[PDB]
């Protein structure tokens, strides 16, 4: 029920699964993994 990798992520719409390994990349505008 969340976003995926390389998916347009927003600050107000942080749907990206931040509980797994999906975090809105700071540099890019697309969600990235989490080392």
From Swiss-Prot:
Expressed by the venom gland. Changing residue 29 to A: Small decrease in ability to inhibit Nav1.2/SCN2A, and no change in activity on Nav1.7/SCN9A. Changing residue 27 to A: Important decrease in ability to inhibit Nav1.2/SCN2A, and no change in activity on Nav1.7/SCN9A. The modification Pyrrolidone carboxylic acid (Glu) is found at residue 1. The record marks 6, 26-27, 30, 32 as: Binds to the extracellular loop of voltage sensor domain II of sodium channels (Nav1.2/SCN2A and Nav1.7/SCN9A). It is found in: Secreted. The keyword Disulfide bond applies. Keywords: Amidation, Disulfide bond, Ion channel impairing toxin, Knottin, Neurotoxin, Presynaptic neurotoxin, Pyrrolidone carboxylic acid, Secreted, Signal, Toxin, Voltage-gated sodium channel impairing toxin. Two forms of huwentoxin-IV exist in the venom of H.schmidti, a non-N-terminally modified (HwTx-IV) and a naturally modified peptide with pyroglutamic acid residue at position 53 (mHwTx-IV). mHwTx-IV shows no observable difference with the unmodified toxin when applied to the TTX-S sodium channel of DRG neuron (IC(50)~50 nM) or when tested on hNav1.7/SCN9A (IC(50)=30.8 nM). In addition, similarly to the unmodified toxin, mHwTx-IV has only a weak affinity for lipid membranes. The modification Isoleucine amide is found at residue 35. Changing residue 33 to A: Important decrease in ability to inhibit both Nav1.2/SCN2A and Nav1.7/SCN9A. Disulfide bonds join 2-17, 9-24, 16-31. Its main location: secreted. Changing residue 26 to A: Important decrease in ability to inhibit Nav1.2/SCN2A, and no change in activity on Nav1.7/SCN9A. Shows a weak or no inhibition on rNav1.4/SCN4A (IC(50)=3.9->10 uM) and hNav1.5/SCN5A sodium channels (IC(50)=>10-25 uM). This toxin has also been shown to weakly inhibit Kv11.1/KCNH2/ERG1, Kv1.2/KCNA2 and Kv1.3/KCNA3. The presence of a 'disulfide through disulfide knot' structurally defines this protein as a knottin. Belongs to the neurotoxin 10 (Hwtx-1) family. 22 (Htx-4) subfamily. This lethal neurotoxin (without cyclization at position 53) inhibits neuronal voltage-gated sodium channel Nav1.2/SCN2A (IC(50)=10-150 nM), rNav1.3/SCN3A (IC(50)=338 nM), Nav1.6/SCN8A (IC(50)=117 nM), and hNav1.7/SCN9A (IC(50)=9.6-33 nM). It inhibits activation of sodium channel by trapping the voltage sensor of domain II (DIIS4) in the closed configuration. The toxin neither shifts the Nav1.7/SCN9A activation curve nor modifies the slope factor. It does not slow fast-inactivation of hNav1.7/SCN9A channels. In addition, it has only a weak affinity for lipid membranes. This is Huwentoxin-IV. The chain holds residues 53 to 87 of 89 of the full protein.
């Amino acid at each position: 029920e969340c976003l995926e990798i390389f998916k347009a992520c927003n600050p107000s719409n942080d749907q990206c699964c931040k509980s797994s390994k999906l975090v809105c990349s700071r540099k890019t505008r697309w969600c990235a993994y989490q080392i």
